[PDB]
Amino acid sequence: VEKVFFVTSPIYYVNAAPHIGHVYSTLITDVIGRYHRVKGERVFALTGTDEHGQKVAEAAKQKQVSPYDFTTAVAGEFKKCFEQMDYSIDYFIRTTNEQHKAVVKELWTKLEQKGDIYLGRYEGWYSISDESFLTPQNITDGVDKDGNPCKVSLESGHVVTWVSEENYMFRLSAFRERLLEWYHANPGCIVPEFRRREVIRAVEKGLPDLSVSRARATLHNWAIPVPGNPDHCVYVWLDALTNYLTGSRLRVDESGKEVSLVDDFNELERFPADVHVIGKDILKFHAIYWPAFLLSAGLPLPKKIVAHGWWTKFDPVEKAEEFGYDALKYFLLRESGFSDDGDYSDKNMIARLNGELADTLGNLVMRCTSAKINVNGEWPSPAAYTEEDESLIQLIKDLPGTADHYYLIPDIQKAIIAVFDVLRAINAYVTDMAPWKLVKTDPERLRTVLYITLEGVRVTTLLLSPILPRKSVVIFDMLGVPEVHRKGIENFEFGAVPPGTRLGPAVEVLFSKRS
Ligand code: MET
């Protein structure tokens, strides 16, 4: 199928202000989106806020404001944050939106008509902070915000409470075999692989039915009513997960306001998601519940769920103002793969800013554009190639395919490492050929050295443009790369910018080192 590449972040609870967690998740969503745009594909990237439920209403009660005022305010803080971080998200969704609620009711009704929702009881533990049902084996002893003796979640260490309610139940138990078929048939559907193994183990152990409504009193009436039963409200997670479906059905104008909700998801060619970006703490909701609902409704399943090492639930805008926006994005994407084992100190931030961005990339951009070395201020025409020239060229030609596979996994840290390996190689080659000497001794040779250098800088910069969107534009301007050559798989190929291309005007640092 030729469809719109549909990439999502989770929608974030509005009990608290935006923070690094949310910023991180949306950054990954943004980068994936950007990579596919650079590739030349149609892209719809989605982010947003999760505004209903017990947790949000209780956060609004603490602040002595109405849930409507509170959620609207906090949503605005998330919107301002994501504008400031310089993302390129196509739409920001809110679960308070009327069109979203329509879709929730449609979906609810569909599940009901298939006999997959019945009236039942849930008697068990529940974390209000995670909005998660827990069995007794996922709880242990602990303390609260004061220090009294209570029970807590093994998942998250938040306080749990016993709940005994008549609830609408979804027949999740009936989807165990079909979920297991899905996991085995599509062995890259959950990334990384060890989290895929976690999910499969859990589903193999057995699946209880899932409570999908709560009594309206318990939610402080801050929730979507169940169709044809106003004493019950729809479970915040069914309401939340459905944002992806809603998003896939909203037509959106040139300034990002929703204007129309289509009946059939196929009209916009977005659903199902190609990638759901999530934190590790919401894996079960996305890999177990969400597909079970979709199977029940006869809707298509997402292709990939990528679960990163961070939790979903250190001020980024402050650090971006201190070290640069692109540099901060580079650091977060480079420093952490799929575990929490990463060093986010100012020491390490500066180490990578100076080491990799300034000395490796920045230096190299200045070398191939400086008037000392590139005297004609143009892309020269190469002479014949030595075997050492060819070895570097081979690396540059192989890089797009290698990075493409990493971005598609998706493993953004590995994509960056691949590019920088080539950058290190190019630097080694330059040091070796010493082109500063060649301006005097051997002009014919310098043409070849300089051309290869420029073209390596271009190709690496193209593949880095989803990570450093602003700086990539600065680099391409210095190199004098025409706009048409700054995207499209065509321009991943070696030799795309012809010799004779004039460099851009000089002024002037790309990344400046710090103490
Ligand atoms: C369907 S994604 C919902 C994520 C949840 N609101 C959270 O903050 O973790």
Q: Count the alpha carbons within 13 Å of 499 in the hemisphere toward its beta carbon.
A: 12
HEC profile of 243-261: HHHHHCCEEECCCCCEEEE
Question: Ligand 1 centroid vs 49 CA: distance in angstroms?
Answer: 8
Task: Report helix, strand or coil for 143.
Answer: strand
- Residue with CA nearest ligand 1 atom 7: 12
Domains of the chain, earliest start first? 1-115+237-344 (3.40.50.620), 116-236 (2.170.220.10), 345-515 (1.10.730.10)
Asked whether the bond before 380 is cis by omega within 30 degrees of 0, the reply is: no
| Number of residues that this document lists for the chain | 515
Distances (CA, A) of 2 to 6, 90, 270, 405: 12, 19, 10, 19
CA distance 467 to 253: 26
Query: Which residues, 6+ apart, have CB-to-CB distance to 407 below 8 Å?
Result: 32, 35, 415, 466
Q: Got the DSSP string for 392-452?
A: HHHHHHHHHHHHHHHHHTT-HHHHHHHHHHHHHHHHHHHHHH-HHHHHHH-HHHHHHHHHH
Cβ of 12 closer than 6 Å to ligand 1, yes or no, is yes
Distances (CA, A) of 209 to 56, 113, 131, 206, 323: 25, 17, 16, 10, 49
**What are the Cα distances from residue 445, in Å, to 27, 309, 384, 429?**
43, 48, 8, 13
Resolution in units of Å: 2.7
- From the number of C-beta atoms within 10 Å of its C-beta (0-12, 13-18, 19+), residue 407 rates as buried
Cβ distance 25 to 277 under 8 Å?
Answer: yes
Q: How many CB atoms lie within 10 A of CB 370?
A: 14
Instruction: Give 13 Cα–ligand 1 centroid separation in angstroms.
Output: 6
- The rounded distance, in Å, linking the Cα atoms of 124 and 144 is 19
C-alpha 308 to ligand 1 mean position (Å): 14
Instruction: Tell me if the bond preceding 410 is cis, omega within 30° of 0.
Output: yes
Dist. CA 289–CA 474, nearest whole Å: 45
Residues 428 and 392: their CA atoms lie apart, in Å, by: 10
Q: Return the biggest CA–CA distance within the chain.
A: 87
3-state secondary structure of 383: coil
Give the tokens for residue 307: 């679960």
- Closest ligand 1 atom number to CA of residue 130: 9
**Residue to mutate, 7, 8, 9, 11, ligand 1, most ligand atoms under 8 Å from C-beta:** 11
**From the alpha carbon of 240, which atom of ligand 1 is closest?**
1
CA angle 499, 396, 511 (to 5 degrees): 85
Q: How was this structure determined?
A: X-ray
DSSP conformation class of 328: H
